[model samples]
Target: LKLLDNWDSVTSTFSKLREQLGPVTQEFWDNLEKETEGLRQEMSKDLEEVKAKVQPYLDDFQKKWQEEMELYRQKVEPLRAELQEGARQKLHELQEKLSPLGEEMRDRARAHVDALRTHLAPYSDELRQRLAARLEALKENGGARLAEYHAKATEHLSTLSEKAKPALEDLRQGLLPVLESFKVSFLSALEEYTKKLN
Candidate 1:
């Protein structure tokens, strides 16, 4: 009888310990899964936010490029026409104006051409340098910012994945088996209860 009592007491204590530990284990695994899910969601949101923040800059850069090209075309088109017309007019004017002077007019025509070249030289260099500098700056700024935005987005995604990894591993290792055990035990208990009732 004493042996029976001691055995019963041991069994009761073990059963109580198991009952307490079951909920604790389940809660621990549930909390881990919830934290993992939350991290994944937050990371996804951060990635989207980063993309949204940078999208406007990308669009603005493209639009500005198009506008700059259009403005450049407009500025160049009139200059091209003016250059062609000026060359034709200057030649015609020199030919007519010097026709009477004959051999002596050659020197005067050369002087006219030299003066025209000198006057136009500064304008030509100024236009070229201004356009080149503007386009180069635009290209460099857009490229650098794009690289920075992409790097930041990648880092955010990596961080989110890192944060979730341990919780996901815990879910795979600990929670799945606990859930399976609970399922089997509940089913067995239901069957025994049904048998007893019947």
Candidate 2:
């Protein structure tokens, strides 16, 4: 509905809207600081002046933020297979929609396309032959082989994950202590800041 609502003017107004939006290619922190400066006038010992002074230190904050994300990502890298299994299972479920398989789709498509182009109904004999011909390759090697491939890949992944579970869990357990202390350290620093504020 979001896209649907905008469909009418989106093509026309989008470029104009983007131009009015100003330079968006700058980093978020950089843009936020620029906007903050415009909103806060310079004055001695004012809260606005405090923020202006603190802005330089926030560059340090940004560096620390990226370093923290990299550390967490290194630890979180241990769970790829476990997460992927659920998606594959859901995909194998979605593959269910491709079912109630038959020649009906082929018949309708051929007949409609022919009638659209020629303004005449296709004969039943021609329609039936066309439908059967369309299904021939799929019946033997196309759809059938493609389905076989999906089955093999799904099974191969699960089997591999099942076999590899111990190694992942071993590394995962190590991450428990590794990741947990970062939060304790973060909370401890936050507590220290509260003390300083008081």
Candidate 3:
């Protein structure tokens, strides 16, 4: 009778353990799968949000970069032209104003021309014939136009020289005041643009 009671107690304990552990294990595994699926869905949604947020900034950066580059080109183009034109006009004026000096230079150049001609005298006949033919050909084509260009250039230089002299003197006299005003305006523009950049 004692042996039978002990055997019955052991069987009852083993049955209770299996009944509890079987359901618990199944529930734990199901919860784990559900949690993992939820985590994956959340991560996918977060990634899409992150991508959406970054995309606009990237597009805006490209657009702003292009706009700034274009603006820089536009700003520099006229300034470069103005500076270059100013220098060219100045040089043309100087050449015209120094007409008397040019006559002296031409006189000096004539001597060199003469010496060169003399040195080449042995081949002068052939060279002269070739040069004459070339000149004739040029005359037939557009030599008159070339001469017209020279005349017009000379006239323009003379006019520019006369006009530029007083204008330049005036500018020189008022340079400090002009520069101060320009500096102020430029600085204000720079500040405005810098704020936009930020």
Candidate 4:
């Protein structure tokens, strides 16, 4: 061991060690910060991309629901008018045929209006077309839309995972052991310097 028992040797040696450590330490931390900043930007921009890509499903479903509801209202409205007209017609026919039989049949015929309607009315449009349009819409586009959504989601996940591979690999190769190496060097340097001094 060199005699760092002398004050000048100790001071000189410590100053030289500091000088050796300066530029490398500065570069080390700068590289770390730069790499982390790049990681931050990559994550932020791509997350926004996923949100943007997925919006069509949200928008399409809502728009279709409202459009179908309006179609339902439009279809039912005319059937309502048609049913009323048909009822009026049936009653008028009954009166013409039976009024000559007069007071005897009048109450009985009037009372039977609801019963006649129940037995045979043309409002059968409800059963025929009520949910049919909505269901048909689902059948036509629902499967296609589901396929499209899944494709987008898969593409999104693939992009994120594929893009991250290199970044993660680079970090493992480039950055992970920096602190560990720094620790070993730091302890070895201090122990050596202290030994020479004492």
Question: How well does each candidate superpose onto the true structure, as a TM-score?
Answer: 0.24, 0.32, 0.25, 0.27
Summarize candidate 3's per-residue lDDT along 1-198 as a digit string, tens digits. 599899999999989989988998999899999998899899889888889978988899989999988887888788789989998999899988678778888988998888778777847888899999999898876877888889999999999998899999998879979999999999999999999988
Model-by-model lDDT, in order?
A: 0.88, 0.76, 0.89, 0.83
Q: How many backbone clashes does candidate 2 have?
A: 0
Candidate 2 regions with alpha-carbon error over 4 angstroms: 1-119, 122-124, 159-167
Residue 53 in model 3: lDDT:
72
Measured with C-alpha atoms, the lDDT of residue 179 in candidate 1 is: 89
Ranking by TM-score: 2, 4, 3, 1
- Index of the highest-TM-score prediction: 2
Summing lDDT over every window of 10 consecutive residues in candidate 2, give the lowest-scoring window.
96-105
Task: Give residue 60's lDDT in candidate 1 (0 to 100).
Answer: 95
- lDDT value, residue 68 of candidate 4: 86
Which candidate, 2 or 4, has the higher lDDT? 4
Q: lDDT tens string, model 2, 86-107?
A: 7788877766644533356677
Judge candidate 1 at residue 195 and give its lDDT: 98
Query: Candidate 4: minimum summed lDDT over ten consecutive residues — where?
Result: 119-128
Which pairs clash inside model 4? none
If both were scored by lDDT, which would come out higher, candidate 1 or candidate 2? 1
TM-score of 2: 0.32
